[PDB]
């Protein structure tokens, strides 16, 4: 009856977590894409003088 | 090409002795331990995570592959034995009055018929013959389902579950007291996969 | 007509000479780049480049053929051109030899195989053939000489119009045995031993290496036997009427060239490597 | 009783979880540019591993890479010139996770054997020596992260993860809440949160100060084989046998994006993000890897130059290119 | 011999100018009854094409002309009056295979 009590308590514990809706995390995640667009090499496409792999 | 020139001269070595470690690996033949039994006694009885054990009959170093301390699920480490030589699966005779013949050849069915092992040779140890000789005169083999027609028919029926009979090779042997049987039959067993595997290379077929 | 079988002959020449280019470069250029590492790989490239190089010297014998004999080129080319051509055939039967060997030793010693198979013993066998396979050729490149008779210039073997002689015998003899009766006692004897090997204990099952042995030794006898017992026969050429050192020579020269181009159809093509690259083709 | 009041506790979970969502990633995201079609061609191929590799880690200074193969090799290939830095042996040729270093003085590996096994890179002598092994787990070790020259997480397939001191080899840490065995890691930014997905098609983040979980997600219906934590850190992807892979954000505690396609019907082995997380890299087990645009659920392209299964990929710190190992013995470099 | 070169002369002196030439002296001869290589000169007669059927014509060009003639055949037919184009005919031998060098009928 032990593990069973853990496993209660553990998911009580988890029950209590302040969350918050969906929009608000995409958002957050297409600004981040957004504002690190303009570093990603594989994203745009890098000019062969600065590429290591040449 | 100053610095260069020292980490090219490294990476040729490197590339030598990488070489050189797979040549070794190469000439050597490997056998994985599997069983429900599972420790395989008769075989690690000889006088020579997992455990890797090493022996050399007839100028042949076999290494053997134990897991039964893998406890966890099968098929998530089950592929990193493509290229083991032979699979040597132990199953007892005298646990047919105890469900768990019923489990070893569930076990052995699924192994069998595993896509990895297609091609891979299974020798099959009946182990226990022994004390089945006598535990069958108090027991009969109709709760788990003469010694002689009793074991020819647990044979059979654990050849039986094998799909693939074109692609691979059963080796069934009963088990003896003596250790000279054993090495033997494994080395019999190993010489033929070795044939089939050099023809295979050789483009014959 | 002018001549019907020089011209129904010259065109299979050709056409024997590109297939067999196309398949050596093809043979070569799956080995060396997308193919593992063994000594069957060492064996099918060093007998690949010298059928590849056996084939890309042809067209120059072939051509040679093409204009009636007329040996325009120059007055020393046929000098290294017949010795190279002589090299790469008498390598790719040397090869062939050490692979039928090298398969029977396999087959009835796995042991031995297993534990005493290297890539530097196939490189060191490999540089003893072609060692060997040059002291046999060099009295290629000393005896060439051209004459005229007549117009239509022709290059022949015996000397110019003590030393740098071989009677004709201590040549034309030695290139017979070595290259055709030891090979091929070799390669029966060891696919004959690898055959009761196989149906003692009915090792195999699907009659393929029964076919490819047998395709390989009736080639190998086919393509080899005519032209060596005529290049035999030539010691005898004051008693033997000229019609046939006219006719089954150039046949013998189109059969023993086919077997440079049937090799690899034989040997690598029915490898899983192969099978592998046209399944990903 | 207590089985009822978990059941209980559980229908409120999700009836909180489905209230909190007001739309999905799809809708907002409909809008947006579409990437196109990402082509990388394979720049660098490394050649000399002679068995099936398992493992692989893109160093921190995006130039040094380490390979894992069964054949008992750990080599550190130079990724720019192809030169191999240095190979290690290992004493059990069955390795399935290695793990580099963010200093890039040391090295780690596991496998079948249930030990870690960390070796010094940068010695007095130059030679390569092992300076750590750990044995405190039941099974094999799935996944090995670095977080510094000190500590290390690891996962291993008795249902357990652990944190240990390289410096003393003890278990200071040990989470024991998944019921499956985990079979990937993956590890945040700040290496103060970690996502660890199991066999029975969960997965749970912990604390590594803290050392118990917070949020577990189920989204999936197979056993999960791999996970990789988003470039910004509140959301991380997981890959499994279903032949689909999803995305999980820690602040929604639950599902945002699934991205699969008819024609995939195998598993996925790896998963792993670029540097804004725009598009995501998945290795199959159809010989070939994906690009998905994350935001998405649409294939931005496809990397076809393995023989085998991939069975690793990893994405430079720089994000200049990308490597690829798989089961046919060899590792390419696309960009 | 002179006599069968005479005669295979006449046949193809018809040929070749409206008028015909007739034999006078011998200059040259010969080697054997299969080809004689023969040489003489001719000179401009009574007698013309139309004529020379009739040996008994009524019979001054310098022309000391060389004519091979072979027998058996028309493969050589010296025309000029160089002595290259008769050696691929001078010969009057047999099979080729008599003048055999080892090695032209093959890659050795």
């Known amino acids: ?54 | 090409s100053a610095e260069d020139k020292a980490a090219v001269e490294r990476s040729k070595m490197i590339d030598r002795n990488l070489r050189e470690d797979g040549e070794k690996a190469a000439r050597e033949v490997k056998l994985l331990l599997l069983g429900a039994s599972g420790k395989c006694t008769i075989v690690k009885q000889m006088k020579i995570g997992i455990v890797e054990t090493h022996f050399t009959f007839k100028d042949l170093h076999f290494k053997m592959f134990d897991v039964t301390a893998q406890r966890s699920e099968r098929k998530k480490w089950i592929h990193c034995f493509e290229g083991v030589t032979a699979i040597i699966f132990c199953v007892a005779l005298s646990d047919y009055d105890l469900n768990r013949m019923h489990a070893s050849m569930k076990l052995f069915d699924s192994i069998c018929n595993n896509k990895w092992f297609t091609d891979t040779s299974i020798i099959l140890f009946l182990n226990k013959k022994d004390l089945f000789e006598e535990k069958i005169k108090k027991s009969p083999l109709t709760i788990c389902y003469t010694y002689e027609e009793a074991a020819a028919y647990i044979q059979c029926q654990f050849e039986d579950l094998n799909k693939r009979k074109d692609t691979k090779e059963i080796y069934t042997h009963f088990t003896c007291s003596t250790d000279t049987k054993n090495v033997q039959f494994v080395f019999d067993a190993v010489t033929d996969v070795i044939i089939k595997n050099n023809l295979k290379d050789c483009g014959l077929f | 007509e002018a001549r019907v079988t020089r011209i129904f002959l010259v065109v299979v020449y050709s056409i024997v000479c590109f297939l067999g280019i196309l398949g050596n470069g093809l043979v070569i250029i799956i080995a060396t780049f997308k193919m593992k590492k063994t000594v069957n790989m060492v064996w099918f490239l060093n007998l690949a480049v010298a059928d590849f190089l056996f084939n890309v010297f042809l067209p120059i014998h072939i051509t040679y053929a093409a204009m009636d004999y007329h040996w325009v080129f120059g007055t020393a080319m046929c000098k290294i051109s017949n010795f190279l051509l002589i090299h790469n055939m008498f390598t790719s039967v040397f090869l062939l030899t050490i692979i039928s060997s090298d398969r029977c030793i396999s087959v009835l010693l796995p042991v031995w195989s297993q534990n005493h198979r290297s890539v530097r013993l196939a490189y060191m066998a490999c540089m003893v053939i072609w060692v060997l396979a040059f002291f046999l050729s060099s009295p290629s490149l000393v005896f060439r000489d051209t004459a005229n008779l007549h117009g239509k210039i022709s290059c022949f073997n015996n000397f110019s119009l003590p030393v740098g002689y071989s009677r004709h015998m201590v040549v034309t003899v030695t290139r017979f045995l070595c290259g055709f009766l030891v090979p091929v006692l070799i390669i029966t004897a060891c696919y004959l031993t690898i055959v009761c090997k196989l149906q003692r204990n009915r090792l195999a099952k699907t009659k393929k290496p029964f076919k490819i042995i047998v395709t390989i030794i009736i080639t190998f006898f086919l393509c080899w036997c005519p032209y060596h017992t005529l290049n035999l026969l030539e010691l005898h050429h004051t008693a033997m009427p000229g019609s046939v050192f006219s006719l089954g020579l150039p046949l013998a020269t189109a059969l023993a060239i086919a077997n440079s181009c049937m090799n690899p159809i034989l040997y690598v093509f029915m490898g899983q490597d192969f099978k592998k690259f046209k399944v990903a083709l | 009783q207590l089985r009822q009041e978990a059941e209980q506790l559980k229908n409120q979970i999700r009836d909180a979880r489905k209230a909190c969502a007001d739309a999905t990633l799809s809708q907002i995201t409909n809008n947006i540019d579409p990437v196109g079609r990402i082509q990388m061609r394979t720049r660098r191929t490394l050649r000399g591993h002679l068995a099936k590799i398992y493992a692989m880690h893109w160093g921190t200074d995006s130039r040094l890479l380490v390979s894992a193969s069964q054949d008992g090799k750990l080599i550190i290939w130079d990724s720019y010139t192809t030169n191999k830095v240095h190979a290690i042996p290992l004493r059990s040729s069955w390795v399935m996770t290695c793990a580099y270093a963010p200093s890039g003085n040391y090295v780690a590996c596991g496998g079948l054997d249930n030990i870690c096994s960390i070796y010094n890179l940068k010695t007095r002598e130059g030679n390569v020596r092992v300076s750590r092994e750990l044995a405190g787990h039941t099974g094999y070790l799935s996944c090995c992260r670095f977080l510094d020259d000190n500590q290390i997480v690891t996962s291993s397939g008795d249902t357990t993860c652990a944190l240990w001191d390289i410096e003393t080899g003890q278990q200071t840490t040990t989470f024991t809440g998944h019921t499956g065995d985990v079979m990937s890691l993956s590890l945040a930014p700040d290496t103060r949160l970690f996502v660890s997905g199991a066999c029975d098609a969960s997965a749970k983040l912990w604390d590594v100060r803290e050392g118990m979980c917070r949020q577990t997600f189920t989204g999936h219906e197979s056993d999960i084989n791999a996970i990789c934590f988003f470039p910004n850190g509140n959301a991380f992807a997981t890959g499994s046998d279903d032949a689909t892979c999803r995305l999980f954000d820690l602040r929604a505690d639950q599902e945002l994006m699934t991205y699969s396609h008819d024609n995939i019907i195998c598993g996925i082995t790896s998963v792993s993000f670029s540097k804004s997380g725009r598009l995501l890299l998945a290795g199959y087990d159809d010989f070939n890897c994906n690009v998905w645009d994350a935001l998405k659920a649409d294939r931005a392209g496809v990397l076809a130059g393995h023989d085998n299964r991939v069975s690793c990929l990893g994405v430079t710190d720089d994000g200049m290119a990308v490597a690829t190992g798989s089961w046919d013995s060899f590792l390419k470099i696309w960009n | 011999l002179t006599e069968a070169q005479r005669r295979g002369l006449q046949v193809a002196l018809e040929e070749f100018v409206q008028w015909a030439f007739q034999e006078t002296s011998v200059e040259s001869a010969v080697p054997a009854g299969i080809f004689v290589r023969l040489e003489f000169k001719l000179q401009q007669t009574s007698c013309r094409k139309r004529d020379w059927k009739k040996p008994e014509c009524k019979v001054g060009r310098k022309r000391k002309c060389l004519a091979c003639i072979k027998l058996g055949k028309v493969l050589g037919r010296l025309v000029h009056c160089q002595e290259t184009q008769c050696l691929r005919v001078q010969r009057a031998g047999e099979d080729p295979h008599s003048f055999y060098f080892p090695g032209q009928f093959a890659f050795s």
Do not use: G, W
Request: charged residues 30%; contains cysteine.
């Open chain 1, 1 to 54: 009856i032990a593990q069973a009590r853990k496993l209660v308590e553990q998911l009580k514990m988890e029950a209590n977590i302040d969350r918050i809706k969906v929009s608000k995390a995409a958002a957050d995640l297409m600004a981040y894409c957004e504002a690190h667009a303009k570093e990603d090499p594989l994203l745009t496409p890098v000019p062969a003088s600065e590429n290591p792999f040449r």
